[PDB]
Amino acid sequence: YDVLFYCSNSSSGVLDTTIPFGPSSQPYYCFINSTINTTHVSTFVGILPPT
Amino acid sequence: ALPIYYQHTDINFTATASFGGSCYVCKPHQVNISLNGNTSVCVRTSHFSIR
Ligand SMILES: *[C@@H]1O[C@H](CO)[C@@H](O[C@@H]2O[C@H](CO)[C@@H](O[C@@H]3O[C@H](CO[C@H]4O[C@H](CO)[C@@H](O)[C@H](O)[C@@H]4O)[C@@H](O)[C@H](O)[C@@H]3O)[C@H](O)[C@H]2NC(C)=O)[C@H](O)[C@H]1NC(C)=O
Ligand SMILES: *[C@@H]1O[C@H](CO)[C@@H](O[C@@H]2O[C@H](CO)[C@@H](O[C@@H]3O[C@H](CO)[C@@H](O)[C@H](O)[C@@H]3O)[C@H](O)[C@H]2NC(C)=O)[C@H](O)[C@H]1NC(C)=O
Numbered sequence: 426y427d428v429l430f431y432c433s434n435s436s437s438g439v440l441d442t443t444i445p446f447g448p449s450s451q452p453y454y455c456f457i458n459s460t461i462n463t464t465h466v467s468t469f470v471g472i473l474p475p476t
Numbered sequence: 477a478l479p480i481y482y483q484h485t486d487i488n489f490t491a492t493a494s495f496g497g498s499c500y501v502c503k504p505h506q507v508n509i510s511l512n513g514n515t516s517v518c519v520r521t522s523h524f525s526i527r
């Protein structure tokens with residue numbers, strides 16, 4: 426399957442799809458998505474480092 | 477410590493008890509034990525503490 430990795434500033438991952446490079450000023454939450462016959466499996470993985 | 481965003485969760489291990497079921501000294505009648513009201517609590521955060 427395809428696996429999709431992406432992040433958002435709030436925990437509501439459904440509201441954005443970003444990659445921060447370099448230094449932040451806020452936490453970013455990162456998630457994994459993968460879909461099996463519309464079974465859109467989605468999970469939180471972790472918080473990014475400050476940079 | 478090395479740079480990291482702060483992120484914390486509280487847990488309490490709680491007990492509530494009743495006595496005098498048939499006697500005292502012998503035993504507690506009943507003790508209700510919980511983790512934040514649950515039977516299972518996990519840390520999914522960078523930091524945590526427990527009471
Ligand atoms: C990873 O899998 C997740 C598991 O479901 C994905 O979550 C879903 O993401 C879509 C977008 O991320 C949500 O979209 C919903 O759209 C409805 C419809 O209204 C919207 O569109 C009209 C037309 O464009 C516009 O007028 C409205 O303003 C809206 O913008 C909303 O009403 C919902 O409120 C919501 O936004 C899904 O519900 C959502 N899943 C969950 C659990 O909420 C997530 O997209 C996947 N991640 C990635 C990067 O693909
Ligand atoms: C850990 O247990 C305590 C008790 O089960 C639950 O948190 C307690 O929440 C209150 C309200 O947020 C805290 O403040 C208290 O407010 C009252 C009313 O204004 C005031 O009289 C008390 O002096 C006090 O401020 C209480 O401090 C807090 N207790 C503790 C020990 O932190 C706490 O919710 C528990 N953890 C979880 C995950 O629920």
Ligand SMILES: *[C@@H]1O[C@H](CO)[C@@H](O[C@@H]2O[C@H](CO)[C@@H](O)[C@H](O)[C@H]2NC(C)=O)[C@H](O)[C@H]1NC(C)=O
Nearest residue numbers: 432433434435436437440441442443451452453
């Ligand atoms: C997360 O990043 C988004 C990117 O869309 C922020 O949304 C924008 O915030 C600025 C600053 O808050 C506004 O001027 C833009 O118009 C906003 N985007 C949209 C689509 O309106 C969002 O604030 C960020 N932070 C959080 C916690 O969600």
Ligand SMILES: *[C@@H]1O[C@H](CO)[C@@H](O[C@@H]2O[C@H](CO)[C@@H](O)[C@H](O)[C@H]2NC(C)=O)[C@H](O)[C@H]1NC(C)=O
Nearest residue numbers: 490491492493494495504505506507508509510
């Ligand atoms: C442990 O929990 C039970 C379950 O929450 C408590 O017993 C309940 O008490 C209320 C108030 O008297 C009744 O309406 C419920 O029917 C009782 N539940 C049951 C299953 O009998 C019990 O008192 C708690 N025990 C302790 C030591 O706190």
Ligand SMILES: *[C@@H]1O[C@H](CO)[C@@H](O)[C@H](O)[C@H]1NC(C)=O
Nearest residue numbers: 510511512513514515516517
């Ligand atoms: C687990 O704890 C939350 C604590 O706020 C409570 O709402 C929930 O109903 C408890 N879980 C179960 C299965 O009762």
